[PDB]
Write an enzyme that holds these catalytic residues in place. Structure first.
Site, PDB file in Angstrom:
ATOM      1  CG  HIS A  25      -0.368   0.320   2.511  1.00 16.01           C
ATOM      2  ND1 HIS A  25      -0.067  -0.646   3.448  1.00 16.01           N
ATOM      3  CD2 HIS A  25      -0.054   1.507   3.084  1.00 16.01           C
ATOM      4  CE1 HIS A  25       0.430  -0.071   4.529  1.00 16.01           C
ATOM      5  NE2 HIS A  25       0.447   1.236   4.334  1.00 16.01           N
ATOM      6  CG  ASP A  78      -0.166  -3.929   2.691  1.00 14.88           C
ATOM      7  OD1 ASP A  78       0.129  -3.416   1.590  1.00 14.88           O
ATOM      8  OD2 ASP A  78      -0.350  -3.256   3.728  1.00 14.88           O
ATOM      9  N   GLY A 126       3.082   6.726   8.706  1.00 13.10           N
ATOM     10  CA  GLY A 126       4.340   6.777   7.995  1.00 13.10           C
ATOM     11  C   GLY A 126       5.366   5.760   8.434  1.00 13.10           C
ATOM     12  CB  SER A 172       3.230   1.065   6.694  1.00  9.89           C
ATOM     13  OG  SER A 172       3.549   1.971   5.655  1.00  9.89           O
TER      14      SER A 172
END
Ligand SMILES: CC(C)(C)[C@@H]1NC(=O)O[C@@H]2CCC[C@H]2OC/C=C/C(F)(F)c2nc3ccccc3nc2O[C@@H]2C[C@@H](C(=O)N[C@]3(C(=O)NS(=O)(=O)C4(C)CC4)C[C@H]3C(F)F)N(C2)C1=O
Ligand SMILES: [Cl-]
Ligand SMILES: [Zn+2]
Length: 202
Positions: free
Chosen positions: A78, A102, A158, A160
């Site tokens: 993502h 993901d 911010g 991830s």
């Protein structure tokens, strides 16, 4: 139809800094400013030297983290999508891509250092944020962990693609999503390192 000659190309993911974990103090370092980041995204040519395990990375529209484990720089789909990553020789195509997890990965850049996957089965974890905060996280399931001290979601935005670590500094998972109830982050969801090791051995 569409006018093909003017179809644009999405730029590369660009390393713009790192989380320094080498010594006794954790702190974020920026290695590239906004202008250079946009130029480097377009060319895919990043001549900067790379160091450490956790990189701060950016596209033209987002910024997040990427973590090296067993010679692969991992991040979240993502954030990166299917984008290449800038490197000294030009854009580098993804080596792993799994939207269902993901998860994406590129070959770890030269100069990077890789974390080793955790084997100790400990449930006392530590999340490393883009601000170099080290947040204690108790493991609650295969892919979930609770914050000992909940925080506004803003503090985790911010991060991830950053690591969850065991007490010995081994990689336990990749930060994926937050459990958010009315703006407060009570728990985190991560890609277990075992899921990484399967993706690698698959
Ligand atoms: C409410 C909330 C916190 C925004 C949201 N919670 C949430 O969904 O919880 C549920 C319940 C428990 C797990 C989760 O199940 C759904 C799984 C979602 C996912 F993660 F697997 C995901 N797979 C995708 C695959 C393909 C394309 C898009 C995808 N989009 C996804 O999720 C999206 C993205 C993810 C996100 O923001 N992650 C973080 C982050 O920092 N991003 S970032 O760097 O700033 C940035 C946007 C630049 C890249 C770490 C959390 C930080 F902010 F704390 N999301 C929404 C959330 O965390
Ligand atoms: Cl997974
Ligand atoms: Zn361990």
């Amino acid at each position: 139809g569409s006018h093909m000659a003017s179809m644009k190309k999405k730029g590369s993911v660009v390393i713009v800094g790192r989380i320094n974990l080498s010594g006794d103090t954790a702190y974020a370092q920026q290695t590239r400013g906004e202008e250079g980041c946009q130029e480097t995204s377009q060319t895919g040519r990043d001549k900067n030297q790379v160091e450490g395990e956790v990189q701060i990375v950016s596209t033209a529209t987002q910024t997040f983290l990427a973590t090296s484990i067993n010679g692969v720089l991992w991040t979240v789909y993502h954030g990166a999508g299917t984008r290449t990553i800038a490197s000294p020789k030009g854009p580098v195509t993804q080596m792993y891509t799994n939207v269902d997890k993901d998860l994406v990965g590129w070959q770890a850049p030269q100069g990077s250092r890789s974390l080793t996957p955790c084997t100790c089965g400990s449930s006392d974890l530590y999340l490393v944020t883009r601000h170099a905060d080290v947040i204690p996280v108790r493991r609650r399931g295969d892919s979930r962990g609770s914050l000992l001290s909940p925080r506004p979601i803003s503090y985790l935005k911010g991060s991830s693609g950053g690591p969850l670590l065991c007490p010995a500094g081994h990689a336990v998972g990749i930060f994926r999503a937050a459990v958010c109830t009315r703006g407060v982050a009570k728990a985190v969801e991560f890609i277990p390192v075992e899921s990484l090791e399967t993706t690698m051995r698959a």
